[PDB]
Design a protein around this ligand. Structure first.
Ligand code: ZN
Length: 652
């Protein structure tokens, strides 16, 4: 049964599109769908996220319906799911599955044993004091190398630990109370629970101080520092890297990528000088917190009170199956994804999507060649890169081998650690081997898409090829406004403030003249400042620097897909549908992707942690730089969407 191209009932026609295009296209849906207790936000995207997750739920119920042999993927999935859903067993076990892990931390006797403990835990997939992983060399994209990265913080953005205003201090104290509660639930007395929470926050705050900001983490060249391992470790011996690497079985490692180099220089003296008891309590708190979703309901409720009620504003938890399905999809996603495509993905969608992608690619080449600010040399290298895109649609051509993953069924938490151990070992085995450029970094059932610089690939999972993005019964204008913009957005990531640094082979090599690079940086700075002047809440501005790459990609996707849409329309009589011109339907279909309600807590949280602008701004601000949108709705200077021409910023 065909799905309507545009859900007209979501539109609020009492709002002029020239004044508030977001609420013209979405306002009635927003009025009629106040957020339910368990949702921090909801709207077009989350509707498709939810409907796809329910498909995966049915797939899990199908695989869990039989009894299978150990060592089959069906057994792995069913056994993780069954244990996650067994509330009675999880509640009877309580904190007992955690006890040996805590005793091992309590037994750490000196700083030397602290180093060996970090290696032992990182060998299981942990990130005890810092991150590490194996992935392509940014300067040799055919080779896998070892990378080390700054501490991962529980609140994500380091600013949570530092910012000096009332709301920030309140959040910090609520986090400490969460640590106190789970320490009590793990069996510590009142005095120890207070001590652990206080010391853990102290230690994590000191690490946050020496971390890079979210903005600085996006700087491509700043966060690549390849060197001989021993050149660094001969000099910085406050943390005993030689013992750590030996216990990681990495003493054969000649070179590595020290991504946040100034973090590790400061970590050298922090680790040498930190109080041993305080470091121990930091480890206890991280271990309890990392287990809080895998034990009894008390632990999940304590975690919900902070990460849900406090940080996101929700008042109830989602049904148990949603978290359980999400968990199996994160560990065995390609096993689920193979079933998903066989059951739900029609072959005609892949063929039509490939035609659309090739149309967008042609339009991007046309757009670049028509630029008047870019010289001929840089244009030619830009054409070489866009002609070299790797295009991945629907699903991979080979499926991941999960045969080494040991799932035993003794306890939920125990099997989570085994699945995590498998993922870690699988990553480590890539070291020193040729990079697999065909691998997917998302699953077919993920409602998302991505660009990868080190492969120059664009990837569109089966799950995003659904309405309102891709609708095989819709008119072309609406599909270009939806999935067409998504395609152009991923393509523009190859040319944003990060992607432009990588060439057609995925190598971090400069292909820009100095003049053209300076013009790009000047214009990108203006787009950052433009968004940074918009308020998202009372006294809270958008972060135009953190969202710069995504706002460039949105703008490029709008410009490229519109050109592709006009190219496809050449030589056709324009026909109005629902009284809208095709040009207008392009923009309405784009804006319908973003309609949502969102709690004020969640507005603040996403501003701190999300590189994507809020849906409202991806419509009402992004379109203010699009000449075609002014033309489609004849926007005039007294209209609220209008931005003075000298203040518009067009990067591509
Ligand atoms: Zn993006």
């Amino acid at each position: 049964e065909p799905v309507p191209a545009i859900d007209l009932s979501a539109m609020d026609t009492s709002v002029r599109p020239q004044d508030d295009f977001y609420r013209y296209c979405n306002g009635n849906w927003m009025k009629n769908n106040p957020l339910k207790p368990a949702y921090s936000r909801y709207g077009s995207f989350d509707i498709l996220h939810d409907s796809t997750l329910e498909r995966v739920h049915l797939i899990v119920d199908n695989l869990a319906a039989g009894q299978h042999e150990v060592g089959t993927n069906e057994y792995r999935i069913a056994t993780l799911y069954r244990q996650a859903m067994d509330s009675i067993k999880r509640n009877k076990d309580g904190a007992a599955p955690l006890k040996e892990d805590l005793q091992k931390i309590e037994a750490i006797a000196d700083r030397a044993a602290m180093v060996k403990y970090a290696a032992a835990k990182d060998n299981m997939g942990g990130s005890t004091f810092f991150g590490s992983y194996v992935y392509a060399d940014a300067k040799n994209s055919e080779m896998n190398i070892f990378h080390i990265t700054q501490t991962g913080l529980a609140l994500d953005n380091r600013d949570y630990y530092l910012k000096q205003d009332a709301k920030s201090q309140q959040i910090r104290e609520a986090y400490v109370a969460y640590l106190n509660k789970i320490a009590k639930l793990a069996g510590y007395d009142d005095e120890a629970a207070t001590r652990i929470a206080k010391n853990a926050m102290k230690m994590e705050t000191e690490l946050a101080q020496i971390c890079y900001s979210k903005e600085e983490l996006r700087d491509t060249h700043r966060n690549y520092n390849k060197m001989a391992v021993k050149e660094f470790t001969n000099k910085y011996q406050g943390f005993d890297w030689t013992t750590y690497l030996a216990d990681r079985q990495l003493t054969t490692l000649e070179e590595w990528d020290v991504e946040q180099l100034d973090f590790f220089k400061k970590f050298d003296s922090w680790f040498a000088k930190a109080d041993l008891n305080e470091m121990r309590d930091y480890l206890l708190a991280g271990t309890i917190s990392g287990a809080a979703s895998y034990l009894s309901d008390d632990f999940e409720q304590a975690r919900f009170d902070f990460f849900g009620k406090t940080l996101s504003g929700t008042t109830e938890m989602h049904p148990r199956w949603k978290r359980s399905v999400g968990m199996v999809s994160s560990f065995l996603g390609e096993a689920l994804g193979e079933v998903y495509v066989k059951q739900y993905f029609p072959p005609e969608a892949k063929e039509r999507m490939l035609k659309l992608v090739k149309n967008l690619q042609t339009a991007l080449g046309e757009r670049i060649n028509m630029l008047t600010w870019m010289g001929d040399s840089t244009k030619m290298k830009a054409q070489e890169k866009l002609n070299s895109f790797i295009i991945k649609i629907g699903y991979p051509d080979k499926w991941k081998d999960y045969s080494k993953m040991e799932i035993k069924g003794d306890s939920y938490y125990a099997d989570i650690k085994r699945a995590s151990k498998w993922m870690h070992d699988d990553n480590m085995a890539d070291l020193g081997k040729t990079v697999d450029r065909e691998r997917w970094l998302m699953n077919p059932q993920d409602v998302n898409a991505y660009y990868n610089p080190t492969t120059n690939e664009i990837c569109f999972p089966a799950a995003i090829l659904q309405p309102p993005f891709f609708n095989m019964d819709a008119d072309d204008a609406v599909n270009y406004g939806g999935i067409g913009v998504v395609i152009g957005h991923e393509m523009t990531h190859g040319f944003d403030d990060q992607g432009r640094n990588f060439d057609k082979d995925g190598n971090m090599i400069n292909w820009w003249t100095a003049e053209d690079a300076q013009k790009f940086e000047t214009t990108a700075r203006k787009l950052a400042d433009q968004f940074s002047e918009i308020y998202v809440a009372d006294g809270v501005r958008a972060n135009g620097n953190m969202t710069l790459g995504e706002n460039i990609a949105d703008q490029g996707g709008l410009l490229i897909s519109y050109l592709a849409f006009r190219n496809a329309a050449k030589g056709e009589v324009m026909e109005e549908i629902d009284g809208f011109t095709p040009d207008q339907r392009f923009f309405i279909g784009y804006a319908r992707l973003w309609g949502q309600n969102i709690r004020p807590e969640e507005v603040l949280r996403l501003t701190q942690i999300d590189v994507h602008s809020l849906g409202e701004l991806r419509v009402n601000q992004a379109l203010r730089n699009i000449e075609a949108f002014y033309e489609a709705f004849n926007i005039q200077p007294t209209d609220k969407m209008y931005l003075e021409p000298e203040k518009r910023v067009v990067v591509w």
